[PDB]
Write a protein that binds this ligand. Structure first.
Ligand SMILES: CC1(C)CN=C(N2CCN(c3ncnc4sc(CC(F)(F)F)cc34)CC2)S1
Length: 468
């Protein structure tokens, strides 16, 4: 049950009342994940899913929240008999974690669309019997906290979630699915994935949450979307205020993606007296460097995206080059397709569109253009170098001829006299290439008219040209 002290702020009548509840729970020994997720899902439902009758804020009455809480706790406590899984040393067993996962998973509707909005919270789980992938992992952690299992924590990569538990928190267990059309591995460790150096498991440099970071996760998980064209202003404000609460308490210290998510919100609607979005993106990068060996991709892609939206071509290119410098030390594995898609869209859609506008502006007499800056050309080259190096040693190739056309076009946006100014230096602007593909392309990069076919051959390592 809920404790008397957890009840005293009800009813929640406003955004600020919800923030007060989070503040109170974050001040407790162990914030109550079940309570907090039910509250966020309740308000999200009445602000984004069904706004009929809304006049200001969907009042969250204690009776309503408490009844939701009771259905959750009844469902878990009834289904997981702890006497069957004795807790050796105040820590949980793999069998117990797998049982909790099975209870959540088996509760879900047989058939539904898993990419739907607003199926992330325990409100969704109770009222709709639907959860998204990471929502299952979160629910397992909330269930384990409800059961008294203090050792079970959420583990997060940039594209997946699982749990850590056991002696010293050193065990890992899959508790949910990943992607579409991959085989369930619930109950197994993440060691194979770590060992293969996939992006999905971040070479072991994934997040191991404490309770407060699990609160940060559910706050990041708020979805203000009403439809394709419309966001709930109330939910954006809530999410923003809650992320600032977390930030001020120190709970975003080790959470790069939350910092990027906050920065994005600040760009949309700045809060007076707070750091600028750029400051926040750089704090996210610093976090990744400090805590995660600089092995995360998204801190740089958040930064690049801000510069791209602001049509700052030079800084966007630098940040994408930095992105590629991270990815180069990974192997491209099966289940890494979301990061492949991201890189593909940057290379083959976003950069081309940025450079096309830059070319039109240059024709109109822009000064200090990225297209006349050899450092910008160098960034472009370093972006491609990291992608080519990523591919090296991977079980799965990255590049194909569909990339080559866009590379030739992008290179050609820079005049030969700009491109000539980059000095490509070997080990043992100045640029060093890590990838063998770019080293062999060096020779092609300064011609007034780039040799399109030779580029193509070098990028795809195509052996032959057409017979006839
Ligand atoms: C630069 C981008 C393409 C812009 N948005 C990005 N994301 C990255 C994913 N996301 C997250 N935010 C906070 N915590 C987490 S934890 C996670 C992984 C999984 F959902 F839990 F499995 C995704 C995610 C926020 C939205 S990266």
């Amino acid at each position: 049950g809920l404790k008397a002290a957890q009840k005293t702020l009800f009813p929640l009548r406003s955004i600020d009342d919800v923030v007060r509840l989070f503040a109170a729970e974050l001040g407790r020994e162990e914030p109550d994940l079940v309570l907090l997720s039910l509250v966020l899902g309740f308000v999200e439902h009445f602000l984004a899913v069904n706004r009929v009758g809304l006049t200001y804020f969907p009042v969250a009455d204690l009776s309503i929240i408490a009844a939701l809480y009771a259905r959750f706790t009844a469902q878990i406590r009834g289904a997981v008999d702890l006497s069957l899984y004795p807790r050796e040393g105040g820590v949980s067993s793999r069998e117990l974690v797998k049982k909790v996962s099975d209870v959540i998973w088996n509760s879900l509707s047989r058939s539904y669309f898993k990419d739907r909005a607003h199926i992330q919270s325990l409100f969704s789980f109770i009222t709709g019997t639907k959860l998204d992938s990471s929502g299952v992992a979160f629910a397992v952690v909330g269930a384990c906290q409800a059961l008294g299992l203090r050792d079970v924590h959420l583990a997060l990569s940039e594209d997946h979630a699982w749990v850590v538990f056991g002696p010293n928190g050193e065990q890992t267990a899959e508790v949910t699915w990943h992607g579409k059309g991959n085989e369930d591995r619930r109950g197994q460790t993440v060691n194979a994935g770590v060992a293969e150096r996939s992006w999905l498991y971040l070479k072991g440099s994934y997040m191991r949450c404490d309770r407060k970071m699990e609160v940060a996760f559910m706050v990041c998980a708020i979805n203000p979307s009403i439809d394709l064209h419309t966001d709930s202003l109330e939910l954006l404000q809530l999410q923003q205020k809650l992320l600032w609460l977390l930030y001020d308490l120190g709970h975003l210290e080790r959470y790069p993606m939350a910092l990027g998510n906050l920065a994005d919100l600040e760009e949309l609607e700045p809060t007076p007296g707070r750091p600028d979005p750029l400051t926040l993106y750089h704090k996210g990068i610093a976090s990744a460097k400090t805590y995660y060996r600089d092995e995360h991709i998204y801190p740089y892609m958040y930064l690049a995206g801000y510069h791209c939206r602001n049509r700052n071509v030079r800084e966007a290119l630098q940040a994408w080059a930095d992105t590629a410098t991270v990815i180069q030390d990974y192997n491209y594995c099966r289940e890494d397709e979301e990061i492949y898609k991201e890189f593909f869209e940057v290379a083959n859609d976003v950069i081309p569109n940025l450079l096309k506008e830059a070319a039109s502006l240059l024709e109109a007499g822009s000064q200090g253009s990225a297209l006349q800056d050899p450092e910008c050309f160098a960034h472009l080259l370093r972006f491609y170098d990291g992608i080519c190096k990523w591919e090296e040693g991977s079980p799965t190739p990255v590049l194909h001829v569909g990339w080559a056309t866009f590379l030739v076009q992008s290179l050609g946006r820079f005049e030969g006299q700009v491109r000539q100014k980059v000095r490509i230096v070997s080990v043992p602007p100045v640029l060093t290439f890590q990838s063998e593909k770019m080293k062999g392309m060096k020779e092609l990069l300064v011609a007034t008219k780039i040799n399109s076919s030779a580029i193509k051959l070098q990028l795809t390592a195509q052996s032959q040209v057409q017979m006839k």
